[PDB]
A paper describes a structure:
The 70 kDa heat shock proteins (HSP70s) are an abundant family of ATP-dependent molecular chaperones, involved in many cellular processes including protein folding, prevention of protein aggregation, modulation of protein complexes, and protein transport between cellular compartments. HSP70s bind to extended hydrophobic sequences in newly synthesised and partially folded proteins, in a manner dependent on a cycle of ATP hydrolysis and ADP/ATP exchange. The two main cytosolic HSP70s are the ubiquitously expressed HSC70 (HSPA8), and the stress-induced HSP72 (HSPA1A)3.
The 3-bound HSC70-NBD/BAG1 structure showed the same overall binding mode and confirmed the presence of the hydrogen bond with Ser275. The difference in affinity between 3 and 2, between adenine and adenosine, and between 8-aminoadenine and 8-aminoadenosine illustrates the importance of the ribose group in nucleotide binding. In addition, we found an intriguing difference between the HSC70-NBD conformations of the adenine/adenosine, 8-aminoadenine/8-aminoadenosine and triciribine fragment/triciribine structural pairs. In the three structures with the ligands without the ribose, the phosphate-binding loop 2, which protrudes from the IIA NBD-subdomain and is one of two phosphate-binding loops characteristic for the actin ATPase family, adopts a distorted β-hairpin conformation similar to that in the nucleotide-free HSC70-NBD/BAG1 structure. In this conformation, the peptide groups between Gly201 and Gly202 and between Gly202 and Gly203 are flipped relative to the nucleotide-bound conformation of phosphate-binding loop 2.
Author numbering:
A (entry chain A): 1 to 381
B (entry chain B): 149 to 190, 193 to 261
The structure:
Amino acid sequence: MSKGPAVGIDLGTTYSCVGVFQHGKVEIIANDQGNRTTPSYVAFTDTERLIGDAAKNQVAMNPTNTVFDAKRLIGRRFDDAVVQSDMKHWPFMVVNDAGRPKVQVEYKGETKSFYPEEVSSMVLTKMKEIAEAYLGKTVTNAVVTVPAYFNDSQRQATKDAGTIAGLNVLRIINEPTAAAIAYGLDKKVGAERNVLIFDLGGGTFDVSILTIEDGIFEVKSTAGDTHLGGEDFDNRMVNHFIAEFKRKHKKDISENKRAVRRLRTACERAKRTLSSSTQASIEIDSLYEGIDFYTSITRARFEELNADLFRGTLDPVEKALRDAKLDKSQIHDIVLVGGSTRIPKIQKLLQDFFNGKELNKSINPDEAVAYGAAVQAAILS
Amino acid sequence: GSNSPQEEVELKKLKHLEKSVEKIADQLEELNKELTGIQQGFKDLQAEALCKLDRRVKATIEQFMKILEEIDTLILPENFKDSRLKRKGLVKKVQAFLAECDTVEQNICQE
Ligand SMILES: CN1N=C(N)c2c[nH]c3ncnc1c23
Protein backbone atom coordinates (compact mmCIF):
# COMPACT_ATOMS: atom_id res chain seq x y z
CA MET A 1 0.00 0.00 0.00
CA SER A 2 1.41 3.41 -1.13
CA LYS A 3 0.96 6.87 0.56
CA GLY A 4 -2.65 8.09 0.69
CA PRO A 5 -4.28 11.54 1.02
CA ALA A 6 -5.56 13.29 4.15
CA VAL A 7 -9.07 12.46 5.40
CA GLY A 8 -11.91 14.19 7.24
CA ILE A 9 -13.52 12.29 10.10
CA ASP A 10 -16.75 13.21 11.86
CA LEU A 11 -16.60 11.39 15.19
CA GLY A 12 -20.24 11.24 16.25
CA THR A 13 -22.00 10.13 19.46
CA THR A 14 -23.86 7.24 17.70
CA TYR A 15 -22.38 7.25 14.13
CA SER A 16 -19.09 8.29 12.51
CA CYS A 17 -18.36 9.33 8.90
CA VAL A 18 -15.08 9.54 6.90
CA GLY A 19 -14.53 11.48 3.67
CA VAL A 20 -11.66 12.13 1.27
CA PHE A 21 -11.06 15.05 -1.14
CA GLN A 22 -9.71 13.76 -4.51
CA HIS A 23 -10.41 14.42 -8.24
CA GLY A 24 -11.80 17.91 -7.48
CA LYS A 25 -14.56 16.48 -5.18
CA VAL A 26 -15.27 14.91 -1.77
CA GLU A 27 -16.22 11.26 -1.75
CA ILE A 28 -17.89 9.92 1.39
CA ILE A 29 -16.43 6.50 2.08
CA ALA A 30 -18.63 3.41 2.48
CA ASN A 31 -17.51 0.83 5.10
CA ASP A 32 -17.14 -2.96 4.70
CA GLN A 33 -21.01 -3.33 4.93
CA GLY A 34 -21.49 -0.64 2.24
CA ASN A 35 -22.71 1.99 4.75
CA ARG A 36 -21.51 5.58 4.40
CA THR A 37 -21.86 6.07 8.19
CA THR A 38 -20.55 3.62 10.82
CA PRO A 39 -21.90 3.02 14.36
CA SER A 40 -19.60 4.50 17.07
CA TYR A 41 -19.97 1.15 18.84
CA VAL A 42 -17.37 -1.14 20.40
CA ALA A 43 -18.30 -4.69 21.56
CA PHE A 44 -16.30 -6.93 23.90
CA THR A 45 -17.10 -10.67 23.61
CA ASP A 46 -15.73 -14.01 24.94
CA THR A 47 -13.27 -14.27 21.98
CA GLU A 48 -13.18 -10.97 19.98
CA ARG A 49 -13.42 -7.13 19.90
CA LEU A 50 -15.98 -5.79 17.39
CA ILE A 51 -16.22 -2.22 16.02
CA GLY A 52 -18.94 -0.44 14.03
CA ASP A 53 -21.76 -2.35 12.31
CA ALA A 54 -20.49 -5.68 13.81
CA ALA A 55 -20.75 -4.21 17.35
CA LYS A 56 -24.24 -2.64 16.82
CA ASN A 57 -25.60 -5.93 15.32
CA GLN A 58 -24.95 -7.95 18.55
CA VAL A 59 -26.06 -5.28 21.02
CA ALA A 60 -29.27 -7.17 21.82
CA MET A 61 -27.20 -10.29 22.54
CA ASN A 62 -24.46 -8.60 24.62
CA PRO A 63 -25.87 -5.39 26.16
CA THR A 64 -23.45 -5.00 29.14
CA ASN A 65 -20.27 -5.30 27.07
CA THR A 66 -21.31 -3.15 24.06
CA VAL A 67 -20.04 0.41 24.56
CA PHE A 68 -21.50 3.44 22.76
CA ASP A 69 -21.79 7.18 23.62
CA ALA A 70 -18.04 7.41 24.49
CA LYS A 71 -18.32 10.98 23.05
CA ARG A 72 -20.60 11.92 26.00
CA LEU A 73 -17.77 10.85 28.43
CA ILE A 74 -14.58 11.94 26.56
CA GLY A 75 -12.50 14.55 28.42
CA ARG A 76 -14.92 14.72 31.39
CA ARG A 77 -14.34 14.10 35.11
CA PHE A 78 -16.31 11.26 36.80
CA ASP A 79 -18.29 13.73 38.93
CA ASP A 80 -19.43 15.77 35.85
CA ALA A 81 -23.29 16.28 35.98
CA VAL A 82 -23.34 14.91 32.39
CA VAL A 83 -21.46 11.67 33.37
CA GLN A 84 -23.75 11.15 36.47
CA SER A 85 -26.99 11.73 34.45
CA ASP A 86 -25.98 9.92 31.20
CA MET A 87 -24.79 6.66 32.92
CA LYS A 88 -28.43 6.11 34.13
CA HIS A 89 -29.44 5.09 30.58
CA TRP A 90 -26.34 2.97 29.66
CA PRO A 91 -26.50 -0.86 30.04
CA PHE A 92 -22.66 -1.03 30.49
CA MET A 93 -20.73 0.02 33.67
CA VAL A 94 -19.00 3.42 34.07
CA VAL A 95 -16.42 3.34 36.94
CA ASN A 96 -14.16 5.90 38.66
CA ASP A 97 -10.35 5.80 38.46
CA ALA A 98 -8.86 8.85 40.28
CA GLY A 99 -11.61 11.28 39.21
CA ARG A 100 -11.65 9.98 35.60
CA PRO A 101 -14.47 7.87 34.03
CA LYS A 102 -13.65 4.38 32.66
CA VAL A 103 -15.99 1.89 30.99
CA GLN A 104 -15.84 -1.50 32.79
CA VAL A 105 -16.59 -4.54 30.60
CA GLU A 106 -15.97 -8.33 30.21
CA TYR A 107 -13.26 -8.88 27.57
CA LYS A 108 -11.82 -12.39 26.78
CA GLY A 109 -13.40 -13.68 30.04
CA GLU A 110 -11.54 -10.96 32.04
CA THR A 111 -12.83 -7.71 33.69
CA LYS A 112 -11.26 -4.76 31.83
CA SER A 113 -11.59 -0.95 31.98
CA PHE A 114 -10.85 1.57 29.18
CA TYR A 115 -10.73 5.37 29.16
CA PRO A 116 -13.31 7.16 26.82
CA GLU A 117 -10.42 8.27 24.55
CA GLU A 118 -9.28 4.57 24.32
CA VAL A 119 -12.85 3.62 23.19
CA SER A 120 -12.93 6.55 20.64
CA SER A 121 -9.45 5.46 19.40
CA MET A 122 -10.92 2.02 18.46
CA VAL A 123 -13.74 3.80 16.49
CA LEU A 124 -11.13 6.09 14.88
CA THR A 125 -8.99 3.00 13.95
CA LYS A 126 -12.11 1.61 12.18
CA MET A 127 -12.66 4.96 10.26
CA LYS A 128 -8.91 4.85 9.27
CA GLU A 129 -9.19 1.18 8.09
CA ILE A 130 -12.39 2.07 6.13
CA ALA A 131 -10.45 4.86 4.31
CA GLU A 132 -7.41 2.54 3.66
CA ALA A 133 -9.64 -0.27 2.22
CA TYR A 134 -11.33 2.15 -0.22
CA LEU A 135 -8.25 4.14 -1.44
CA GLY A 136 -5.98 1.05 -1.37
CA LYS A 137 -3.36 3.35 0.24
CA THR A 138 -2.08 4.03 3.80
CA VAL A 139 -3.92 6.78 5.78
CA THR A 140 -2.11 8.86 8.47
CA ASN A 141 -3.25 12.52 8.24
CA ALA A 142 -6.75 13.44 9.43
CA VAL A 143 -8.98 16.36 10.55
CA VAL A 144 -11.43 15.27 13.30
CA THR A 145 -14.54 17.27 14.26
CA VAL A 146 -15.91 18.08 17.75
CA PRO A 147 -19.02 20.12 18.82
CA ALA A 148 -18.33 23.89 19.20
CA TYR A 149 -19.14 23.79 22.98
CA PHE A 150 -16.35 21.21 23.70
CA ASN A 151 -13.83 22.53 26.28
CA ASP A 152 -9.98 22.14 26.32
CA SER A 153 -10.07 18.73 28.11
CA GLN A 154 -12.72 17.38 25.66
CA ARG A 155 -10.72 18.66 22.62
CA GLN A 156 -7.34 17.24 23.86
CA ALA A 157 -8.99 13.87 24.74
CA THR A 158 -10.26 13.56 21.08
CA LYS A 159 -6.74 14.43 19.79
CA ASP A 160 -5.37 11.67 22.12
CA ALA A 161 -7.97 9.21 20.61
CA GLY A 162 -6.60 10.03 17.11
CA THR A 163 -2.97 9.71 18.35
CA ILE A 164 -3.70 6.31 20.04
CA ALA A 165 -5.42 5.24 16.69
CA GLY A 166 -2.10 6.03 14.89
CA LEU A 167 -3.40 9.15 13.11
CA ASN A 168 -1.60 12.46 12.73
CA VAL A 169 -4.42 14.82 13.75
CA LEU A 170 -3.99 17.97 11.54
CA ARG A 171 -6.63 19.99 13.40
CA ILE A 172 -9.70 19.64 15.56
CA ILE A 173 -12.36 21.75 13.90
CA ASN A 174 -15.87 22.61 15.02
CA GLU A 175 -18.77 20.60 13.50
CA PRO A 176 -20.75 23.81 12.54
CA THR A 177 -17.52 25.25 10.98
CA ALA A 178 -17.12 21.98 8.94
CA ALA A 179 -20.79 22.12 7.72
CA ALA A 180 -20.28 25.85 6.73
CA ILE A 181 -17.01 24.85 4.87
CA ALA A 182 -18.92 22.06 2.95
CA TYR A 183 -21.36 24.72 1.54
CA GLY A 184 -18.42 27.05 0.71
CA LEU A 185 -20.03 29.85 2.79
CA ASP A 186 -16.54 31.25 3.53
CA LYS A 187 -15.82 31.82 -0.22
CA LYS A 188 -18.97 34.00 -0.82
CA VAL A 189 -18.60 37.72 -1.78
CA GLY A 190 -19.13 40.33 0.95
CA ALA A 191 -17.66 41.67 4.21
CA GLU A 192 -19.30 39.62 7.00
CA ARG A 193 -21.60 36.55 6.96
CA ASN A 194 -23.76 35.42 9.93
CA VAL A 195 -24.42 31.68 9.70
CA LEU A 196 -26.90 29.60 11.73
CA ILE A 197 -26.19 25.87 11.74
CA PHE A 198 -29.14 23.66 12.66
CA ASP A 199 -27.81 20.25 13.68
CA LEU A 200 -30.40 17.56 14.53
CA GLY A 201 -28.66 14.18 14.33
CA GLY A 202 -27.32 11.16 16.21
CA GLY A 203 -29.24 11.58 19.48
CA THR A 204 -28.36 15.30 20.05
CA PHE A 205 -29.59 18.70 18.88
CA ASP A 206 -27.11 21.54 18.37
CA VAL A 207 -27.73 25.10 17.10
CA SER A 208 -24.61 27.24 16.55
CA ILE A 209 -24.23 30.78 15.24
CA LEU A 210 -20.99 31.70 13.50
CA THR A 211 -19.62 34.82 11.84
CA ILE A 212 -17.38 34.62 8.77
CA GLU A 213 -15.10 37.51 7.80
CA ASP A 214 -12.49 36.99 5.02
CA GLY A 215 -12.74 33.20 5.61
CA ILE A 216 -12.14 33.38 9.37
CA PHE A 217 -14.62 31.66 11.72
CA GLU A 218 -15.85 33.01 15.10
CA VAL A 219 -18.31 31.00 17.29
CA LYS A 220 -20.90 33.57 18.47
CA SER A 221 -23.30 31.26 20.40
CA THR A 222 -24.36 27.60 20.94
CA ALA A 223 -27.79 26.25 22.09
CA GLY A 224 -29.70 22.95 21.93
CA ASP A 225 -30.73 19.68 23.65
CA THR A 226 -28.14 16.88 24.32
CA HIS A 227 -30.92 14.26 24.18
CA LEU A 228 -33.17 14.88 21.16
CA GLY A 229 -33.40 13.06 17.87
CA GLY A 230 -35.03 10.46 15.63
CA GLU A 231 -35.56 7.95 18.49
CA ASP A 232 -37.94 10.41 20.26
CA PHE A 233 -39.96 10.91 17.07
CA ASP A 234 -40.01 7.14 16.59
CA ASN A 235 -41.25 6.74 20.14
CA ARG A 236 -44.27 8.94 19.40
CA MET A 237 -45.30 6.77 16.37
CA VAL A 238 -44.78 3.60 18.55
CA ASN A 239 -47.19 4.98 21.20
CA HIS A 240 -49.67 5.86 18.48
CA PHE A 241 -49.74 2.30 17.15
CA ILE A 242 -49.81 0.68 20.58
CA ALA A 243 -52.91 2.78 21.33
CA GLU A 244 -54.45 1.84 17.93
CA PHE A 245 -53.86 -1.87 18.67
CA LYS A 246 -55.58 -1.46 22.10
CA ARG A 247 -58.62 0.26 20.49
CA LYS A 248 -58.98 -2.31 17.66
CA HIS A 249 -58.10 -5.58 19.51
CA LYS A 250 -58.35 -4.71 23.24
CA LYS A 251 -54.82 -6.15 23.68
CA ASP A 252 -51.71 -4.43 25.09
CA ILE A 253 -48.55 -5.38 23.13
CA SER A 254 -46.31 -3.21 25.35
CA GLU A 255 -44.92 -5.92 27.67
CA ASN A 256 -43.87 -8.21 24.77
CA LYS A 257 -40.41 -6.80 23.88
CA ARG A 258 -40.28 -8.65 20.48
CA ALA A 259 -43.66 -7.23 19.44
CA VAL A 260 -42.55 -3.76 20.49
CA ARG A 261 -39.28 -4.09 18.53
CA ARG A 262 -41.03 -5.28 15.33
CA LEU A 263 -43.39 -2.28 15.57
CA ARG A 264 -40.46 0.15 16.40
CA THR A 265 -38.40 -1.09 13.42
CA ALA A 266 -41.45 -0.60 11.10
CA CYS A 267 -41.99 2.92 12.57
CA GLU A 268 -38.34 3.99 11.98
CA ARG A 269 -38.80 2.91 8.27
CA ALA A 270 -42.28 4.58 8.02
CA LYS A 271 -40.78 7.88 9.32
CA ARG A 272 -38.14 7.73 6.50
CA THR A 273 -40.93 7.12 3.89
CA LEU A 274 -42.88 10.15 5.30
CA SER A 275 -39.95 12.43 4.37
CA SER A 276 -40.59 11.74 0.63
CA SER A 277 -44.28 10.51 0.67
CA THR A 278 -47.46 11.75 2.44
CA GLN A 279 -48.46 8.30 3.66
CA ALA A 280 -46.69 5.11 4.70
CA SER A 281 -48.22 1.62 5.14
CA ILE A 282 -47.10 -1.12 7.56
CA GLU A 283 -48.02 -4.82 7.33
CA ILE A 284 -46.88 -6.90 10.32
CA ASP A 285 -48.03 -10.53 10.36
CA SER A 286 -48.82 -12.28 13.68
CA LEU A 287 -47.64 -9.17 15.65
CA TYR A 288 -49.08 -10.22 19.03
CA GLU A 289 -51.25 -13.18 20.01
CA GLY A 290 -51.33 -14.28 16.36
CA ILE A 291 -53.07 -10.99 15.37
CA ASP A 292 -51.95 -9.38 12.05
CA PHE A 293 -51.37 -5.61 12.16
CA TYR A 294 -52.00 -3.84 8.82
CA THR A 295 -52.25 -0.12 9.03
CA SER A 296 -50.97 3.22 7.74
CA ILE A 297 -50.04 6.70 8.88
CA THR A 298 -50.18 10.04 7.02
CA ARG A 299 -47.45 12.75 7.24
CA ALA A 300 -50.04 15.07 8.98
CA ARG A 301 -50.65 12.58 11.87
CA PHE A 302 -46.92 11.96 12.25
CA GLU A 303 -46.39 15.77 12.40
CA GLU A 304 -49.31 16.05 14.94
CA LEU A 305 -47.86 13.28 17.21
CA ASN A 306 -44.50 15.21 17.35
CA ALA A 307 -45.88 18.81 17.12
CA ASP A 308 -44.26 19.88 20.48
CA LEU A 309 -40.85 18.25 19.69
CA PHE A 310 -40.72 19.88 16.22
CA ARG A 311 -41.89 23.36 17.37
CA GLY A 312 -39.57 23.06 20.38
CA THR A 313 -36.53 23.01 18.07
CA LEU A 314 -37.11 26.74 17.46
CA ASP A 315 -36.54 27.66 21.12
CA PRO A 316 -32.84 26.78 21.05
CA VAL A 317 -32.66 28.83 17.87
CA GLU A 318 -34.13 31.77 19.79
CA LYS A 319 -31.66 31.25 22.64
CA ALA A 320 -28.68 31.19 20.27
CA LEU A 321 -29.79 34.47 18.51
CA ARG A 322 -30.18 36.07 22.01
CA ASP A 323 -26.61 35.10 23.18
CA ALA A 324 -25.08 36.15 19.81
CA LYS A 325 -27.01 39.53 20.20
CA LEU A 326 -28.54 39.14 16.70
CA ASP A 327 -32.01 39.56 15.17
CA LYS A 328 -33.28 36.60 13.00
CA SER A 329 -33.23 38.97 9.95
CA GLN A 330 -29.45 39.32 10.40
CA ILE A 331 -28.79 35.66 9.53
CA HIS A 332 -27.18 35.29 6.09
CA ASP A 333 -27.11 31.48 5.72
CA ILE A 334 -28.96 28.59 7.35
CA VAL A 335 -27.27 25.13 7.32
CA LEU A 336 -29.26 21.91 7.91
CA VAL A 337 -27.13 19.13 9.46
CA GLY A 338 -28.19 15.67 10.80
CA GLY A 339 -30.57 12.97 9.55
CA SER A 340 -33.70 14.40 11.21
CA THR A 341 -33.37 17.74 9.24
CA ARG A 342 -34.76 15.69 6.30
CA ILE A 343 -38.20 15.96 8.05
CA PRO A 344 -40.34 18.38 5.91
CA LYS A 345 -42.05 19.87 9.01
CA ILE A 346 -38.74 20.78 10.67
CA GLN A 347 -37.72 22.45 7.30
CA LYS A 348 -41.14 24.25 7.12
CA LEU A 349 -40.87 25.62 10.72
CA LEU A 350 -37.22 26.78 10.14
CA GLN A 351 -38.02 28.48 6.77
CA ASP A 352 -41.23 30.00 8.35
CA PHE A 353 -39.15 31.27 11.31
CA PHE A 354 -36.65 32.95 8.93
CA ASN A 355 -39.46 34.51 6.77
CA GLY A 356 -39.34 32.25 3.68
CA LYS A 357 -35.50 32.24 3.41
CA GLU A 358 -33.90 29.32 1.44
CA LEU A 359 -32.00 26.61 3.38
CA ASN A 360 -28.63 25.00 2.56
CA LYS A 361 -29.73 21.32 2.43
CA SER A 362 -28.33 19.81 -0.87
CA ILE A 363 -25.41 18.00 0.79
CA ASN A 364 -26.42 14.80 2.59
CA PRO A 365 -27.25 15.93 6.15
CA ASP A 366 -25.51 12.95 7.81
CA GLU A 367 -22.39 13.55 5.66
CA ALA A 368 -22.01 17.44 5.56
CA VAL A 369 -19.65 17.54 8.61
CA ALA A 370 -17.31 14.79 7.18
CA TYR A 371 -17.52 16.59 3.76
CA GLY A 372 -16.22 19.89 5.20
CA ALA A 373 -13.63 18.07 7.37
CA ALA A 374 -12.32 16.36 4.15
CA VAL A 375 -12.16 19.79 2.38
CA GLN A 376 -10.24 21.10 5.44
CA ALA A 377 -7.87 18.08 5.46
CA ALA A 378 -6.91 18.58 1.77
CA ILE A 379 -5.92 22.16 2.60
CA LEU A 380 -4.06 21.44 5.84
CA SER A 381 -1.74 18.80 4.43
CA GLY B 1 -56.07 -17.34 -12.17
CA SER B 2 -54.77 -13.74 -12.47
CA ASN B 3 -51.09 -14.54 -11.42
CA SER B 4 -48.89 -11.58 -12.29
CA PRO B 5 -45.11 -11.33 -13.10
CA GLN B 6 -45.00 -8.62 -10.37
CA GLU B 7 -45.97 -11.28 -7.81
CA GLU B 8 -43.00 -13.46 -8.94
CA VAL B 9 -40.66 -10.73 -7.67
CA GLU B 10 -42.34 -10.86 -4.24
CA LEU B 11 -42.37 -14.67 -4.10
CA LYS B 12 -38.66 -14.67 -4.95
CA LYS B 13 -37.92 -12.44 -1.95
CA LEU B 14 -39.88 -14.76 0.34
CA LYS B 15 -38.08 -17.85 -1.03
CA HIS B 16 -34.71 -16.28 -0.19
CA LEU B 17 -36.01 -15.57 3.32
CA GLU B 18 -37.20 -19.19 3.63
CA LYS B 19 -33.64 -20.35 2.70
CA SER B 20 -32.16 -18.00 5.42
CA VAL B 21 -34.71 -19.40 7.99
CA GLU B 22 -33.66 -23.04 7.21
CA LYS B 23 -29.97 -22.05 7.76
CA ILE B 24 -30.85 -20.53 11.16
CA ALA B 25 -33.07 -23.60 11.98
CA ASP B 26 -30.06 -25.91 11.24
CA GLN B 27 -27.91 -23.88 13.71
CA LEU B 28 -30.72 -24.36 16.30
CA GLU B 29 -30.68 -28.16 15.64
CA GLU B 30 -26.85 -28.26 16.07
CA LEU B 31 -27.23 -26.22 19.26
CA ASN B 32 -29.72 -28.84 20.45
CA LYS B 33 -27.22 -31.68 19.74
CA GLU B 34 -24.47 -29.82 21.63
CA LEU B 35 -26.90 -29.31 24.51
CA THR B 36 -27.61 -33.04 24.64
CA GLY B 37 -23.85 -33.57 24.49
CA ILE B 38 -23.12 -31.36 27.55
CA GLN B 39 -25.99 -32.72 29.76
CA GLN B 40 -24.55 -36.33 29.45
CA GLY B 41 -20.76 -35.96 28.77
CA PHE B 42 -18.69 -35.82 32.03
CA LYS B 43 -19.26 -28.84 37.71
CA ASP B 44 -17.91 -25.29 36.86
CA LEU B 45 -17.00 -26.57 33.32
CA GLN B 46 -20.67 -27.57 32.69
CA ALA B 47 -21.89 -24.06 33.72
CA GLU B 48 -19.29 -22.41 31.37
CA ALA B 49 -20.35 -24.81 28.54
CA LEU B 50 -24.11 -24.08 29.09
CA CYS B 51 -23.64 -20.28 29.35
CA LYS B 52 -21.45 -20.51 26.13
CA LEU B 53 -24.52 -22.21 24.55
CA ASP B 54 -26.46 -19.20 25.97
CA ARG B 55 -24.49 -16.74 23.74
CA ARG B 56 -25.23 -19.09 20.79
CA VAL B 57 -29.01 -19.34 21.44
CA LYS B 58 -29.10 -15.53 21.89
CA ALA B 59 -27.33 -15.24 18.46
CA THR B 60 -29.95 -17.66 16.98
CA ILE B 61 -32.89 -15.64 18.48
CA GLU B 62 -31.32 -12.45 17.03
CA GLN B 63 -31.00 -13.93 13.51
CA PHE B 64 -34.71 -15.03 13.64
CA MET B 65 -35.70 -11.50 14.83
CA LYS B 66 -33.72 -9.82 11.98
CA ILE B 67 -35.62 -12.17 9.51
CA LEU B 68 -38.97 -11.04 10.89
CA GLU B 69 -37.89 -7.40 10.44
CA GLU B 70 -36.99 -8.06 6.79
CA ILE B 71 -40.38 -9.80 6.30
CA ASP B 72 -42.10 -6.74 7.86
CA THR B 73 -40.75 -4.47 5.03
CA LEU B 74 -43.02 -6.34 2.52
CA ILE B 75 -46.27 -4.77 1.30
CA LEU B 76 -48.39 -7.34 -0.46
CA PRO B 77 -51.55 -6.19 -2.25
CA GLU B 78 -54.66 -8.25 -1.33
CA ASN B 79 -54.65 -9.84 -4.84
CA PHE B 80 -51.15 -11.29 -4.13
CA LYS B 81 -52.87 -14.19 -2.34
CA ASP B 82 -50.03 -16.66 -2.89
CA SER B 83 -47.42 -14.14 -1.50
CA ARG B 84 -49.61 -13.25 1.50
CA LEU B 85 -50.08 -17.00 2.28
CA LYS B 86 -46.33 -17.68 1.99
CA ARG B 87 -45.46 -14.60 4.13
CA LYS B 88 -48.02 -15.73 6.78
CA GLY B 89 -46.63 -19.31 6.90
CA LEU B 90 -42.98 -18.15 7.13
CA VAL B 91 -43.77 -15.75 10.06
CA LYS B 92 -45.54 -18.63 11.86
CA LYS B 93 -42.58 -20.96 11.14
CA VAL B 94 -40.05 -18.40 12.56
CA GLN B 95 -42.33 -17.78 15.61
CA ALA B 96 -42.46 -21.56 16.36
CA PHE B 97 -38.61 -21.65 16.17
CA LEU B 98 -38.41 -18.65 18.58
CA ALA B 99 -40.69 -20.53 21.04
CA GLU B 100 -38.13 -23.45 20.77
CA CYS B 101 -35.24 -21.00 21.35
CA ASP B 102 -37.06 -19.70 24.50
CA THR B 103 -37.41 -23.31 25.79
CA VAL B 104 -33.57 -23.71 25.51
CA GLU B 105 -33.15 -20.39 27.46
CA GLN B 106 -35.66 -21.75 30.12
CA ASN B 107 -33.35 -24.75 30.68
CA ILE B 108 -29.87 -23.15 30.66
CA CYS B 109 -28.12 -20.55 32.96
CA GLN B 110 -30.76 -21.40 35.71
CA GLU B 111 -30.68 -21.46 39.57
C1 LIG C 1 -35.66 9.87 4.42
N1 LIG C 1 -34.76 9.76 5.59
N2 LIG C 1 -33.60 9.02 5.40
C2 LIG C 1 -32.74 8.86 6.44
N3 LIG C 1 -31.62 8.09 6.22
C3 LIG C 1 -32.95 9.43 7.76
C4 LIG C 1 -32.42 9.52 9.03
N4 LIG C 1 -33.30 10.30 9.85
C5 LIG C 1 -34.39 10.69 9.08
N5 LIG C 1 -35.49 11.41 9.33
C6 LIG C 1 -36.33 11.55 8.30
N6 LIG C 1 -36.22 11.09 7.08
C7 LIG C 1 -35.10 10.35 6.79
C8 LIG C 1 -34.17 10.15 7.80
